[PDB]
Amino acid sequence: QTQQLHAAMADTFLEHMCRLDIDSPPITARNTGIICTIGPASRSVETLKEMIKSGMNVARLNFSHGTHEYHAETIKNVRTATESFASDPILYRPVAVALDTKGPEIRTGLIKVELKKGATLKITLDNAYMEKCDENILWLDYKNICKVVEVGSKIYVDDGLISLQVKQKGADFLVTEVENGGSLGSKKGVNLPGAAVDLPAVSEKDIQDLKFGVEQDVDMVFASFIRKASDVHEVRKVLGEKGKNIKIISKIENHEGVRRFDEILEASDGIMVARGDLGIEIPAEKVFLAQKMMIGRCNRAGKPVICATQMLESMIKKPRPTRAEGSDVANAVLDGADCIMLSGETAKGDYPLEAVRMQHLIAREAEAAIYHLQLFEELRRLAPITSDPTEATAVGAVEASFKCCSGAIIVLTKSGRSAHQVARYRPRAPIIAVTRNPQTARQAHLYRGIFPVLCKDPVQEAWAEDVDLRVNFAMNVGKARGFFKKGDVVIVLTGWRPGSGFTNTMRVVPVP
Amino acid sequence: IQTQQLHAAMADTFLEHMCRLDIDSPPITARNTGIICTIGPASRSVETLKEMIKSGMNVARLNFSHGTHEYHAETIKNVRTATESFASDPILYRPVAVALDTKGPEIRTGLIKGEVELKKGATLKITLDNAYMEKCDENILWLDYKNICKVVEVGSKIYVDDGLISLQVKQKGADFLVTEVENGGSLGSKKGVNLPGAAVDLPAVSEKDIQDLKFGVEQDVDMVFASFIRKASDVHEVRKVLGEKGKNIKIISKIENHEGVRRFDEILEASDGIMVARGDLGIEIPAEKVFLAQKMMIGRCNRAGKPVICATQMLESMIKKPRPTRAEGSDVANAVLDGADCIMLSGETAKGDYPLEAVRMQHLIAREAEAAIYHLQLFEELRRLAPITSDPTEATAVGAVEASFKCCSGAIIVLTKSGRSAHQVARYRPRAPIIAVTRNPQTARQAHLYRGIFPVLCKDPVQEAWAEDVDLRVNFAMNVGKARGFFKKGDVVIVLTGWRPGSGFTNTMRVVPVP
Amino acid sequence: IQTQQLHAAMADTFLEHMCRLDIDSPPITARNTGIICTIGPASRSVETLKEMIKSGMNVARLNFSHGTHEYHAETIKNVRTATESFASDPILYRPVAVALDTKGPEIRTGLIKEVELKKGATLKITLDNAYMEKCDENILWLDYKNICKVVEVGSKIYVDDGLISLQVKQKGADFLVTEVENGGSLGSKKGVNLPGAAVDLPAVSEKDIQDLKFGVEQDVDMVFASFIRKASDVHEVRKVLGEKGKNIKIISKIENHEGVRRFDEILEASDGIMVARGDLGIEIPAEKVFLAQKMMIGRCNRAGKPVICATQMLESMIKKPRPTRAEGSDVANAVLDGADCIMLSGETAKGDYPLEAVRMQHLIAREAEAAIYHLQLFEELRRLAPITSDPTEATAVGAVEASFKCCSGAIIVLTKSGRSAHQVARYRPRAPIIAVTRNPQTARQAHLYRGIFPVLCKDPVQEAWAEDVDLRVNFAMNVGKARGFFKKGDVVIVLTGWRPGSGFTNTMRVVPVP
Ligand SMILES: O=P(O)(O)OC[C@H]1O[C@](O)(COP(=O)(O)O)[C@@H](O)[C@@H]1O
Ligand SMILES: O=P(O)(O)OC[C@H]1O[C@](O)(COP(=O)(O)O)[C@@H](O)[C@@H]1O
Ligand SMILES: O=P(O)(O)OC[C@H]1O[C@](O)(COP(=O)(O)O)[C@@H](O)[C@@H]1O
Ligand SMILES: O=C([O-])C(=O)[O-]
Ligand SMILES: O=C([O-])C(=O)[O-]
Ligand SMILES: O=C([O-])C(=O)[O-]
Ligand SMILES: [K+]
Ligand SMILES: [K+]
């Protein structure tokens, strides 16, 4: 029994669970993409190389902190570490760069502090106190707060750990009662659930950052606090035609984003289940519901989805994660998430590498436990009857791959989409996407199962032989990575002519 | 609005699928189930034999329990004359197989003394005395089976003429038997006799059977329907007689008795296909049990990828009437819904008053039945029970069929020499017709045994560049498709080829628009 | 090893289920599908009519397109004489329903001057009543006096079970000139069918009203209403049956294109449906019948209402003691489709082998019932069942579920109107439903539903209602033992109510047999 072969042959979901075996080793290929946030603990080229070794697929820059040149330097360090392996196209791994926006977030000022259950707290908009915060007065970013808050509303501060109830309202001040204490630091996040904030989804600073990313030639944008389709369209407009290829991933962080989800998903390249803010904005017991709902609909719609925030919190201070954290990652993968994300764990943690290694390990185990019979089956029934060659070839390829127990599905692609279409049907076997486009190579990490492979060889002449060469390139990468051996059987997808959108050929071929 | 039960096939449950079946939903012009017609007095003329091909006959059956070698030699000639009369156009031409159905170990009566009527109660004597072999009446009756008195019993039931006459043995003699008529009816000349629950010792392949098989090999037949097969060793005997000169001739075992049903897995395994011979079976085992046997055998053949023919009395009524009974229409439909590769007419086309109308009716019902097939559940269950194999051809076939459901394709075009590339696509039961393009005339004719395979014979000379030779055969299929109304210009199609010439290199699937 | 296809029903897939079907696995002695026999010259005698009950006839059909009112009045008397001849023993006694099948809006020819028709030779059709008994190869008379208004130059006219076909060449005022398209010999008073032509004959005619009112008086159990085409036609039958016969079940017969199309409309207004294949097979194309049949049986199963598969199930046996392979196959499939009842017409009305025909239906239905994939069936019937807060329904589903679990020999159900039993039936248990009632009419009507064994209690109403219940439960218990449905040690499901009167069933008990 390899990678839960006996588990996947079961008739029922329950019999499948019962047959799950801890002593059944997974395949060396790991399908779920890993996204790491880069900060003080992971910024050095030296450790940044080791994160790629450990399995980081995408690098996140959080734009709610740091200056433009702080990030410009981070990107440089990432590309230095990444291209340090470029001297060997076979073992080399593309690494994407992601810009996560600040967005319409509310922050406190600087502390001059411990708060007590009962003791009152005044909230001012007076900029004279913006660096003089204590147990009596507190300053905020949101200068229009007094228009949307209420006598009796709950205000949450610092990851929703401090809660306050508004007793009295003023013109530019609010009198609150501390409902649960804890200590208050500098520049902390503020939430207002059940209160319709009027801050724009794309602000002035947001426009600056997006235009900056376009120039830094980023791969994707994680747009914070998206609440409707019109907000997604605004991000597109700002990115413009110069960055029209940059992927837009909408972050669902609030009640409205959950509710107008179908509206949003439709207008976006992908979705991130931003659990941090979401866990404050809606009740904490409801998050798993939202998470599973969104991952399912993304799976149904073939668009990428990232499970994010607090997946391994413990590891910010500890070398081993809690049982619940290990359980959380596994389930996120079993839910069908394309990518999983580390934040604090890799930005400011004491154990950034161990945290990444742990994500690889769990995702690989979780991928084996996937009931591929029922999954692929249900994904067919819900797939549309289409007369598009590419789609038909993709379904057929995945189907063939389950039948001949193949080691990989090799796919030649320019824009990435040929590979995207194979991925949405979730084969067991890894999809090796061979492209010459460096950007689509990096972007391919958003999709579950896609192993992007960048070809550096010059364009041969006879297009037939040029194809063959790229196919053999994939073949060598496969052998070297231990995805398959010599005698093994493999699926190869090509097109009848050059250019995007002509994939129509599936071949079953033994390995050289 | 809603073609070939598209709304019916999209249902979640088998019951919801039945409820959504709509009489006003027209089927596709392609009909997948093969039709096999028995040729006799009513269908022997080249002239009417042409019209049977027009109507949809795919295979011609010669029943070798009647007629002389040269009677059949002439029938075959007439068949090939009618078939090649369309050969002047490779696009509209249809290959037609020839089948030899053996006499086998059957028991017959003698001739009625110069129609005798039998009465419930009146006794009847059965003699082996060859002096009475042409002097049969209500008192004496002669038989073929000279070893009958060794396997029959005082109290055994003997059935005569399609099991319509029944007799109980009262006394046993050395060469005679005294019986009591249990239900009457009139007795004719040379009628079939059945002995259920009595182990007959007649050989499966007799001397006459060997003569007929060797004759078929020489007449270059396509398939053998072997009567009264009871075990694997009987199948192996047919192989041996057919020899190396006729090693390509398909062996279809006919299940006609209790033992054949029981050692079925043993038999199917050793045979190229199976025929559910309902006529004799319905006498040999209880009539209420036939449907069980039928459904069991069709399912196991579907599981095993081997062809299966539902046979005998599918449209009896039409021997004398232009319209079939409601039960007969229902029977054909169910046979197809059960998953039968071919359906067969016997008396209906051999000696009937309406041979053509009988064939037209089979086409019509089979086409309607094929639309009503719950393809979601069928294909699905055929995957789960398909073996995990590292054979390129098989993987390409499954993927092709899968792709065809996805892009709603009009056909799956398959280049094949031996037929097997096409066989492997057929066992997964696509909606779309499989157009099998071959140069081998024999595999073209044999391809009719498999559900969904449209054999197409290429007469063009071998082009040079093998690449272009392939392209030409692919375009040949394309033209046949357009002309037959299987697909139009803009339509999407699946094409299966190999990486090099020779059998067993199919590994390439292409999704291609039609010229 | 393996009783009534136990190994076949344990399969994971429909295909694996087919493969595991075994001819050497004997069925249970209980047979669930109801048998309906048409009574005529061959089966009219009290003496043979007793033997039909012995063989398994559950309902008796009277075809009202032939015979006079007193012909039928006599037939009914003979049926009730044969039936009550077993009444001297309540345990072995079997209730037998009486059914009135209407004539309806049918078209007939006149009397022959038999005459032979030839492909090509022309034929004139007259409405002139002077020729109504002078029919030959040149002239032919008809019932439908408004025919010339709905037929066309080029229309096809079918005569005698759709075996003769004619094409209209010229149209007149009261005549039609046709060309014979396929011959055959023409007899007296034969059925005529006009497909694709909208006939304006009323669904319930004057004669139909007379027959319905006659049935009400003869205290019939059900009405098979011919040529129903819309819900308004069903409502007309109700009105005529009135309040004096409001308990008489209305089974609509689907015989034409319009009836198929407005089926949901019809089924919804009717107590049940009959797939009248004879006329339907002429009215719509013969290749399309199986589709219609399977569609209608499925929808009736979904809707919990009875459905009868009818006409030409065993034609061969009108003249032969053994049926054709196709006929044996047809019956089986009709049962496998989920039909509540199967019907013999010519086979028992005018056949040479009425008894052998009934015995054959028993035998096939019993084999077919064993082959039923009960896992998938019951399962799909739950998913499509409505979430209801009705006690009776909940108790029925739970009972059937319990019966699959404890491999029970029966489900015993006390019922007055029959409905408690109807609700258990629609979920299709393996085990036979023994419905114990005192109402003689609901006992006879219970035969319309698959699986229901109606049992009539003749004992006087005991006093303590608790003991009165117990007695009826023990009555069922004795009937079960005597019929060989179960033994002493066996386990059984019992359904009762908390108080007397209809619609209080809410109690399910699992009980060993005395
Ligand atoms: O970007 P897409 O839509 O995946 O297109 C993939 C294309 O790549 C090919 O494999 C060849 O690519 P090139 O044109 O770059 O040589 C085509 O056959 C196919 O149409
Ligand atoms: O059904 P078969 O006998 O395996 O035929 C499949 C063969 O057809 C082909 O497409 C053409 O074969 P030939 O060139 O020998 O005619 C081969 O590539 C492939 O091996
Ligand atoms: O099917 P119905 O007409 O609702 O009959 C069920 C009724 O029969 C009983 O089992 C017996 O009551 P009766 O004595 O009135 O017949 C009741 O408990 C129950 O309400
Ligand atoms: O921004 C995030 O990652 C969040 O809110 O979880
Ligand atoms: O062999 C046959 O076809 C039969 O017995 O019916
Ligand atoms: O009347 C009928 O029963 C029919 O037409 O089938
Ligand atoms: K024969
Ligand atoms: K009638």
Ligand SMILES: [Mg+2]
């Ligand atoms: Mg956030």
Ligand SMILES: [Mg+2]
């Ligand atoms: Mg035979």
Ligand SMILES: [Mg+2]
């Ligand atoms: Mg009728």
